[PDB]
Amino acid sequence: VDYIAANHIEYIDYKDTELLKRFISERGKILPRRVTGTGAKNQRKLTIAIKRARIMGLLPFVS
Amino acid sequence: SQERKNEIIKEYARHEGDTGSPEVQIAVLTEDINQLNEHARTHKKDHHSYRGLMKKIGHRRNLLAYLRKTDIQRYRELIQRLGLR
Amino acid sequence: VMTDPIADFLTRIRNANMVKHETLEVPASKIKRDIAEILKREGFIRDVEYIEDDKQGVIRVFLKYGKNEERVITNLKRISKPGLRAYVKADEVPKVLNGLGIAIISTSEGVITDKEARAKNIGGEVIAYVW
Amino acid sequence: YIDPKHLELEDRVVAINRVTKVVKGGRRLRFAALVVVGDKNGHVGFGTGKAQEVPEAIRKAIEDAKKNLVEVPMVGSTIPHEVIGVFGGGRILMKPAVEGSGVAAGGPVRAVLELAGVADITSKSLGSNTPINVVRATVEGLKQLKRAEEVAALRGKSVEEII
Amino acid sequence: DTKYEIMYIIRPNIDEEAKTALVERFDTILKDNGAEVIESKDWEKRRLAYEMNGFREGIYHIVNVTSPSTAGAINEFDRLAKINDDIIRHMIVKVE
RNA sequence: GGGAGACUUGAGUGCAGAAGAGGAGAGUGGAAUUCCAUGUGUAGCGGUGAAAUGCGUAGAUAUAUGGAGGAACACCAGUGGCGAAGGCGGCUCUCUGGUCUGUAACUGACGCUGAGGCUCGAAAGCGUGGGGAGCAAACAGGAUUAGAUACCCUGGUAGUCCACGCCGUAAACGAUGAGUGCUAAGUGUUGGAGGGUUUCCGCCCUUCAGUGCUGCAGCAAACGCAUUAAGCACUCCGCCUGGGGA
Numbered sequence A: 001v002d003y004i005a006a007n008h009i010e011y012i013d014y015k016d017t018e019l020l021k022r023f024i025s026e027r028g029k030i031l032p033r034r035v036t037g038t039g040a041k042n043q044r045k046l047t048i049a050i051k052r053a054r055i056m057g058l059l060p061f062v063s
Numbered sequence B: 001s002q003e004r005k006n007e008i009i010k011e012y013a014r015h016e017g018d019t020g021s022p023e024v025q026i027a028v029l030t031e032d033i034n035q036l037n038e039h040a041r042t043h044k045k046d047h048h049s050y051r052g053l054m055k056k057i058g059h060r061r062n063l064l065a066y067l068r069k070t071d072i073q074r075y076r077e078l079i080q081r082l083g084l085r
Numbered sequence C: 001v002m003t004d005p006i007a008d009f010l011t012r013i014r015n016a017n018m019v020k021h022e023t024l025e026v027p028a029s030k031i032k033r034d035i036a037e038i039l040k041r042e043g044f045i046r047d048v049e050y051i052e053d054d055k056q057g058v059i060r061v062f063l064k065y066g067k068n069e070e071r072v073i074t075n076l077k078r079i080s081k082p083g084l085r086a087y088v089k090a091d092e093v094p095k096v097l098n099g100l101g102i103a104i105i106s107t108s109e110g111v112i113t114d115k116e117a118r119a120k121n122i123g124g125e126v127i128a129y130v131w
Numbered sequence D: 001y002i003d004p005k006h007l008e009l010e011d012r013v014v015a016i017n018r019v020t021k022v023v024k025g026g027r028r029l030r031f032a033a034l035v036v037v038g039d040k041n042g043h044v045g046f047g048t049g050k051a052q053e054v055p056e057a058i059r060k061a062i063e064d065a066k067k068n069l070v071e072v073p074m075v076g077s078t079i080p081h082e083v084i085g086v087f088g089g090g091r092i093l094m095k096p097a098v099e100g101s102g103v104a105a106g107g108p109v110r111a112v113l114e115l116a117g118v119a120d121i122t123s124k125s126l127g128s129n130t131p132i133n134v135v136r137a138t139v140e141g142l143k144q145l146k147r148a149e150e151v152a153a154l155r156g157k158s159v160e161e162i163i
Numbered sequence E: 001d002t003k004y005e006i007m008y009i010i011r012p013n014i015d016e017e018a019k020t021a022l023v024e025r026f027d028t029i030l031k032d033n034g035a036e037v038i039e040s041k042d043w044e045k046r047r048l049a050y051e052m053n054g055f056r057e058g059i060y061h062i063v064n065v066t067s068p069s070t071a072g073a074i075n076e077f078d079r080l081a082k083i084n085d086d087i088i089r090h091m092i093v094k095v096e
Numbered sequence F: 001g002g003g004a005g006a007c008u009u010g011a012g013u014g015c016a017g018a019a020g021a022g023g024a025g026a027g028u029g030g031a032a033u034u035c036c037a038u039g040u041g042u043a044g045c046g047g048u049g050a051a052a053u054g055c056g057u058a059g060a061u062a063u064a065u066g067g068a069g070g071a072a073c074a075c076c077a078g079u080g081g082c083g084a085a086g087g088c089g090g091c092u093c094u095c096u097g098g099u100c101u102g103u104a105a106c107u108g109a110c111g112c113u114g115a116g117g118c119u120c121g122a123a124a125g126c127g128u129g130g131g132g133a134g135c136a137a138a139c140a141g142g143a144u145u146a147g148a149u150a151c152c153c154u155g156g157u158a159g160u161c162c163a164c165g166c167c168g169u170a171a172a173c174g175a176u177g178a179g180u181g182c183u184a185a186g187u188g189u190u191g192g193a194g195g196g197u198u199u200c201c202g203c204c205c206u207u208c209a210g211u212g213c214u215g216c217a218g219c220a221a222a223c224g225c226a227u228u229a230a231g232c233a234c235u236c237c238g239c240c241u242g243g244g245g246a
Ligand SMILES: CN[C@@H]1[C@H](O)[C@H](NC)[C@H]2O[C@@]3(O)C(=O)C[C@@H](C)O[C@H]3O[C@@H]2[C@H]1O
Pocket: D024, D025, D026
């Protein structure tokens, strides 16, 4: 199930740590879009947001 | 800039609302060519953007050749206005 | 970019004939209509109808198949091409399959078959062979 | 399909090829024979037979050729019209010839045409000379041949109007 | 014009007066160099996912600004933010 | 073919949208290796098919905490995307190219190809000046072997990195020039568009452009290709004519 489409949000702020945490596995590794059921476009946007969040410290790089 | 493009189109339009025509396209192409020449002189190594510039130059030359073939007087007038050779 | 619409027309007929398609459509022209009517009155096609549009008109051809769905048109070939134009004098007019086929020829009297051309004793441009 | 029975068929051995299969001990020699069986009246066919012995291979080929008989249109002493037949590398061109010109062909094509009954024709093999492929190419051209009556009936015109 | 969003982290230790001085100083920088700060705010105070400059805590402050793309306000802000010690880390992103 | 007109479908402009490791410039982030400093700590560590060289009582390896510096960017990541090709994968910003889908306001054939020319062009290499962690031609040592100018092991310079300028070659490959049209289907996937549902999500249908797989007709020496042709056709260019010599 594409969570992004279900929630019906078109913009992915890199500040919504609550939103991002459901797309990263334990240890902080990003999840495959096949695993998460999300689409390709949303996956790219999530990737950018998660990377930016990691840089700004909202999310951990490892562990 | 689309506003710059629109004002150029209005200036060189053969008549009202003539978006596409040899003169309009050539004028717009020339302004883009000049701006992109500045960009290349700034970034000598932007070879891909330079290829786009060369495509624009070739297209502009083809339009000029067609205009010269069709109406030489308009060709002379346009080169005078745009300062071309 | 298309460079020989007549050759493209012949190719469309050949491909549709190969797959035994019932009909085919082509952009229309005076030469194409001449060729189509020659085939019509020679019996190589079932019928020809013309559709009027805003661009250039459209010509529709109904392929003719005999009993057992046999193809009447064996094949078509473009003889005179933009790369190499072909012209034949009166005594040079060809016979396709010893007359079983036809050769569409354009002359001062218009687009006519080889039989008519050599009956009139005139040459021209050998547009195509059909058989 | 053509029924071999009721037809006075005669055969000619186009070629006998000594073919080998390599086996653990050594060679295993066999004979592959290509045969053309015809009626001298417009019916002809070709067959292939493999056997340890030449006579058996020829017999198998003749039986196969009878099963594969085909009929060829013929106008007078020659074929109706020019035709080029291709099978694999084989490529044969055949054109009608005037009366008395003979069968100007080579090897396998001579057998096919003579057996089919054609007497005056010109031919040229523009492809490979492999006997099996040239024979196959020849029959492809002969099948391509067409009859004036059938063509006229198909086109919906009289034979005179066609010609 | 092009919309920018600027989120920067002020160190946890700073006094409120010093933080206000820092925020006002950088607002002046943006305005003078040509950017129009449509809004500025202290977004939150959060523990960092990892230690940054020897701190496990920070004060995330957001600044939504608008400026022409050619204007160098963003560039000057970035230079000065790097120079300053009070700010730990800053991110500037174009926002649609 | 020439000349004089007309036309809008090709071509391009406008208008409205879409995605992208496209390119160039300047910054910046964490992981990890090596080195450096200082703790704890004692005899090995490292390596091989097996060993040895090597490092270690001048306290190594390991371990904790810092600091330095260079290079590449795990997860996402996917016959996924972009690019003419080479190629492009952290993130941020500036400049900039192209492509695709809508509409049909605009010009009215303005197009395709393109010898000679010009530009780009992996890696290696060359010049000048820096940078240099890791890796590593050459080279040193230890092994292996009949020999071992190798494969294996321990080190290791150029180089790999950056800036400018040369070099212009690759199995630079889809070993398949470019443009255009036509010729069964089935099924994934990328970016759009429209509609019928659907509360939305979504589902279904239609369609445009990419990308894959299977597979008709047709083609093929066969292997196989098959709307992303190696099928049916036309235009232009490049190239081939037994092997070696070369
Ligand atoms: C081990 N026995 C072998 C074995 O059976 C071989 N078949 C696989 C067999 O084969 C043969 O029969 C053959 O046909 C070949 C020949 C060289 O030896 C023959 O004897 C062969 C026998 O000697």
